[PDB]
Write a protein that binds this ligand. Structure first.
Ligand SMILES: NC(=O)c1ccc[n+]([C@@H]2O[C@H](COP(=O)([O-])OP(=O)(O)OC[C@H]3O[C@@H](n4cnc5c(N)ncnc54)[C@H](O)[C@@H]3O)[C@@H](O)[C@H]2O)c1
Lengths: 49, 49, 49, 42
């Protein structure tokens, strides 16, 4: 589809009854985000596929 | 790390850089014989960590 | 600051430089922008480290 | 003939680079085999 803007903050909308795992490889801190929250990657974070 | 993989678990079939030490499982096909000399093959799954 | 007949040194910073009669310009350098947890391998050719 | 290891070196007067020849097959093990754990199975 339309190519994404690499310079834009990468974001994802976790659905209801769902969770994601992201690890900040720079600051060395993991977190699990629950619920319908919106998750935005930091400059070094990644998504646990 | 050079590990084993495949349906009959052949050796040197998966080179790896990091070792995964989380709850997983691998499956192998085992051919065995009974005391009545009946040849029968198995399919097992080994939960490991 | 005193320099010998073969001494190399680096001129850097916000400034206007005019080459002297006894000074020959060898190379122009640009800083390498590195994010945190990124880096380069530099060899100190004077000592090799 | 000796080996100088560490800092950068300038061959002084009355010095020259010396060649170390290896037994046949040792060079093959050195260059082909970088990781024996990966050299045996391929
Ligand atoms: N709890 C679970 O049920 C669970 C958990 C993790 C993975 N799995 C999956 O179950 C599947 C079983 O398939 P299979 O065994 O028939 O395929 P396979 O025979 O090709 O799998 C080889 C086995 O080696 C292990 N492995 C692979 N890469 C590794 C690494 N870098 N370090 C350490 N171990 C490694 C895997 O866990 C896998 O079980 C795996 O592919 C795996 O993705 C299940």
């Amino acid at each position: 589809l339309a190519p994404r803007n690499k310079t834009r903050v990468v974001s994802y909308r976790v659905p209801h009854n769902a969770a994601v795992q992201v690890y900040d490889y720079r600051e060395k801190r993991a977190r699990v985000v629950f619920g319908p929250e919106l998750v935005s990657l930091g400059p070094e974070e990644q998504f646990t596929v | 790390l050079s590990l084993s993989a495949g349906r009959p678990k052949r050796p040197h079939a998966r080179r790896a850089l990091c070792l995964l030490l989380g709850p997983d499982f691998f499956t192998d096909v085992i051919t065995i014989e009974t005391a009545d000399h009946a040849r029968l093959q198995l399919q097992l799954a080994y939960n490991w960590h | 600051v005193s320099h010998q007949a073969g001494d190399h040194w680096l001129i850097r910073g916000p400034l206007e430089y005019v080459p002297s009669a006894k000074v020959e310009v060898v190379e122009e350098r640009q800083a390498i922008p590195l994010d945190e947890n990124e880096g380069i391998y530099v060899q100190d050719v004077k000592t090799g480290k | 003939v000796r080996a100088v290891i560490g800092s950068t070196y300038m061959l002084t007067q009355d010095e020259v680079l010396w060649e170390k020849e290896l037994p046949p097959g040792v060079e093959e093990l050195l260059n082909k085999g970088q990781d024996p754990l990966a050299d045996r199975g391929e």
